[PDB]
Amino acid sequence: ATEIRASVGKMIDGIGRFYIQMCTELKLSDYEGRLIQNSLTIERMVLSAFKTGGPIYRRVDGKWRRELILYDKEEIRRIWRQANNGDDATAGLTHMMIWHSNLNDATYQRTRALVRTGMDPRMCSLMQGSTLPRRSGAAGAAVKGVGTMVMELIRMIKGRRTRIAYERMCNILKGKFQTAAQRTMVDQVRESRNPGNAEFEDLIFLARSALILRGSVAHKSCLPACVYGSAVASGYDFEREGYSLVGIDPFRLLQNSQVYSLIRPNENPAHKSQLVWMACHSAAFEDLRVSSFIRGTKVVPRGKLSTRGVQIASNENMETMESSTLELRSRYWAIRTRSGGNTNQQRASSGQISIQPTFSVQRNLPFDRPTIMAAFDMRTEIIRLMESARPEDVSFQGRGVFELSDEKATSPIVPSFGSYFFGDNAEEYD
Amino acid sequence: ATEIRASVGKMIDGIGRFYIQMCTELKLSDYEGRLIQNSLTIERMVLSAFKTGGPIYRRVDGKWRRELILYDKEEIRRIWRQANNGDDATAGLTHMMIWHSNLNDATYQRTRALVRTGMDPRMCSLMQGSTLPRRSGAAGAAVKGVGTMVMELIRMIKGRRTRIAYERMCNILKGKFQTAAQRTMVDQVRESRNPGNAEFEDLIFLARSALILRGSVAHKSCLPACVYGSAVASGYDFEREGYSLVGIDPFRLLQNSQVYSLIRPNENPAHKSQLVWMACHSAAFEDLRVSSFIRGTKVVPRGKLSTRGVQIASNENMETMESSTLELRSRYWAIRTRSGGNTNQQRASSGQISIQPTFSVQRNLPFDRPTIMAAFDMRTEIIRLMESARPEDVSFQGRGVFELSDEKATSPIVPSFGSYFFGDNAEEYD
Amino acid sequence: ATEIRASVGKMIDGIGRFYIQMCTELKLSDYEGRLIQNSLTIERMVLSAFDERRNKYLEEHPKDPKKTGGPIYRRVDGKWRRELILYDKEEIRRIWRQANNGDDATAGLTHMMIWHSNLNDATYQRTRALVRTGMDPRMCSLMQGSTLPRRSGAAGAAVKGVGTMVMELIRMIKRRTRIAYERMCNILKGKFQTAAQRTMVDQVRESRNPGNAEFEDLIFLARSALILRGSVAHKSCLPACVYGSAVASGYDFEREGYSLVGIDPFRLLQNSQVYSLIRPNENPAHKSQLVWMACHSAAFEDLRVSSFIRGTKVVPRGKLSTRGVQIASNENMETMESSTLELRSRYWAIRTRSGGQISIQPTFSVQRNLPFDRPTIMAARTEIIRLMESARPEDVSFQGRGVFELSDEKATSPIVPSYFFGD
Ligand SMILES: Cc1onc(-c2cccnc2Cl)c1C(=O)N1CCN(c2ccc([N+](=O)[O-])cc2Cl)CC1
């Protein structure tokens, strides 16, 4: 707890000090250093370094300008290592990768990659950290969704360190499944010699089941490097105060930060804001209802967002680019979870699924058809188990949201009530 | 294109000139000639002729009066042929039949005819042109729904020109199915010698499948004969301008026309208007949402309509009949389609059917149960195919509605969102 | 002109640059530097150093005369710490001039005084001052700039309300320097929009040895200004930390220009984050309202139009769950928390110095009011009473003019939509 916050606090302090340093080298104004487009470029540089470069955006003569500078990968590596007091500090590096992953999960649908892997494009909610490199951190492995892990394994399926790297991924995936039957099936894929089609068939099954019998996937609020550096510069001490990725800390920091974004002509600044907000709290596949309740303003589906990606291609001309303040604050806050929700328990039920007519009145007589009709080796155990599940089943009982003043999480607020961020395109209306 | 509009333009000009002629014979005032009840009677006469007669409604001494005149079927036939410059002009005749069919599809449910044919009364959406005579036009065959065609075939099943007339109907029905499996099944019904129960069983199957794997059925805006004649009389040239049944033309004409209807005491003139509007654009079984969006005012289900049929039986007394203006104009317009929508393609999917919890918050965890659970000879190919379909699947991508000023259909408007016109009676609430 | 806009941007550059220097001297954190409480102390320091009267006096009557102070605040060992810091006045004066390029630039000092005056009008209704002078405590709404000095510069004089001038005059009447009396009368007359009020204001101006009749005039002349309102300038003057922070981040007010009545101050607060210390039983939202109102001279406005511009409700004073911004020496620092001040707005509006078809002929027999623009048609001591009785609380002003989007930099498309100290 205290020990966790200590190290997390150190790596964020590292990223902070690096950014500030990196910002001075480029002779950037404070405002300019707080432009999200600049942060990502600087973030890109240090990851690429471990020549390199990219677009830097300045405010020259009343108009936005785009230079693109280059640095020695040795020069960058030296700046990173030294900002993290001697050490190579891989931890801060993989933290920036996860922030990039989170934003990629919010910005882009990845059906094109799904169809080549033989996977249902509707499995997107299982795809957390798919753009994240194979053999990422321990932190990376935690953040990767069930679908991400299935997709990595099929690519393998399609130099006997291959054997262990295959076994390493099966165990990662097994750790994520919350039922014994799903876990056992992963053993059968892992135990297999010369992996082929049966294994493919099985992994596609397991992916599908993870939509109802959800896996344990970690979520980490990871902010652009400018937010961290800005704080360090303003006099916040991440090592003395400690820090959390899953507590109030990131919400609290975003409440005291001001980030900017370059915005295109037809784009809506409010919509750009939602995208980066979603990315910041790793909520691309979180129910839109709960996101909305937390943020305070409506969190609208991807297809209704009047916005393109955060990054700006070298194609388009800067002469029409303007700068908006990204709204990243929130009405409430909530603890980020590793849980997938209830996948069994079985204990009791408690509820009502039909009515008994009391009054002679013309009307239909409602009943939960799926549930009533439902009740009439390891594969069937799963089928039988996910068939028992209802969309109405409640997870995270007792758990709620908190006021920004309730930093001890003493008094939770349980909310009362579309849901899919990616369920709103030209092919389907979900 | 130009050639199509040329002939369509001619037959509408024919119907026009006939009506004007027919109106003078009966010494009818222009207003009286634009009474929908009078148009249908005149329409009835020329169809019956190919003695005859029916009720004609006049404005005498401040009250509505009902005479019923008679004509020689030779006299009528002469008036029709000569209004269409020499030719027998069957094309204009079958056009009036389709207008009658459209209005019958909007006015009356036909479950009584469905139960005798051994068909599910819920198949009404497949029943376009069921009141239309067997061996109608080529135009008639196009307008007939899948259920209409199945019902005709069972009646056959229940003089070896019978053999071809059976084969002719199987090929009509086959043309309508958009999948190969459905088409193949029709071959098996057609190839059969001595048609009996297996064929019945099969046709009931095919009808059912056509609710999800919809067939290609044509739709034609066909207006009462008074609307056409009124235009010709006012100086519109249908041959010079050409005409379309599926383009902007009928919408444009309705925007420049004023039709009247006799309305009963308790009836709502707004509701009478919707019925004739639906009939005019062949939209009895079109989604109520899209109808509403096009019309501009709400298109209400049949069971919520405070109106009886357009026609007035010789029973009821005229002394309480009054005359209302039928509102048949529209906010937008749309192209009438021959398509049934997507019945396969299969190519990709793109969407989201579940959520991954990000925040520890008490709530249910939504998922598309039908779709997720779904994925666990020619008959089974169809079952397997319609089981893959979801109510959420989007058809007519890119296609939208148009402003009445956008006659070239250059800039479409894609709308964002009950649905069943006949899903609102004392037995069921759909 | 751009020049008018560039000289205003020059002084904000000065204030900004001065505040930055001051913070480095006080070894303050950036966060600590953006605490409204420190900003005030620092602001209070400069004005004290240039308070020649107090300095001339101290040169005669011995304290530590060369120094000046106030409480600075820091966060130490997880808790806020108040400390009385004493600073050498000459060094403050040097840093001011240096941050204003050798110039003593008293317009920069006056700006900060108007900010404090705006803050004072937001916090306290000043009934005791009013009754002592012999005027109605209800005249509350004409008291803008009353907490300012008598000689306060051109900007300061422009900001002062009608009742402020009246109070100054009555103080003098009840009390070589006939020039000060006559000058203040001109400054009073210039505020009056009607010619009838302007005439009576000259009768008082042109008088030797003013007494009863002159005192009685001003009191009625003030009473009239409640209905027949005066031309009182409203300027958006922000805490020095706001300006300091912007300069520090790289905003160039001289180059970019700046106004106190345009969109500028609204834009700045949109890109600012100001903190306040907050007592245990205080609503941070209500403190924020208070400072927001003080920022935009909004104290005596209609609450409705203030709410409409703001976005959230602008609750009246006696229903506001917060006390003053400053913290007294007797207050317990161990209970102090610091919070963000939400000072952003939904729309913006120009800040005024000010205080076709005329009728309708009915066509349809329908129950309704048959409206007519009362002023235009009808405008064709006793005259004052007549004018006051003629006017109605439902008659509209600033016709056509509305509010603008934050995105609408120019005055393109306006949007056409109560007592803060109400009993
Ligand atoms: C004024 C003012 O002056 N010094 C401070 C100040 C500075 C440092 C520590 N504590 C304080 Cl109080 C201050 C202030 O009120 N702050 C600054 C830091 N804030 C913050 C709180 C939590 C998180 N987090 O969890 O990431 C991030 C941030 Cl930046 C809270 C708001």
Ligand SMILES: Cc1onc(-c2cccnc2Cl)c1C(=O)N1CCN(c2ccc([N+](=O)[O-])cc2Cl)CC1
């Ligand atoms: C006045 C006025 O005088 N002559 C005309 C006039 C007459 C003939 C042709 N063009 C024109 Cl402009 C006119 C006019 O404005 N009309 C009349 C015909 N209209 C119409 C347009 C389309 C369709 N259609 O597609 O079936 C039907 C109809 Cl009736 C449009 C409105």
Ligand SMILES: Cc1onc(-c2cccnc2Cl)c1C(=O)N1CCN(c2ccc([N+](=O)[O-])cc2Cl)CC1
């Ligand atoms: C990113 C980013 O990088 N450089 C700038 C930048 C910096 C300086 C000038 N212009 C710009 Cl655009 C920038 C940005 O978008 N800003 C900073 C300044 N802002 C601002 C706008 C108006 C007023 N005012 O009227 O007082 C005050 C302020 Cl501080 C608007 C938001």
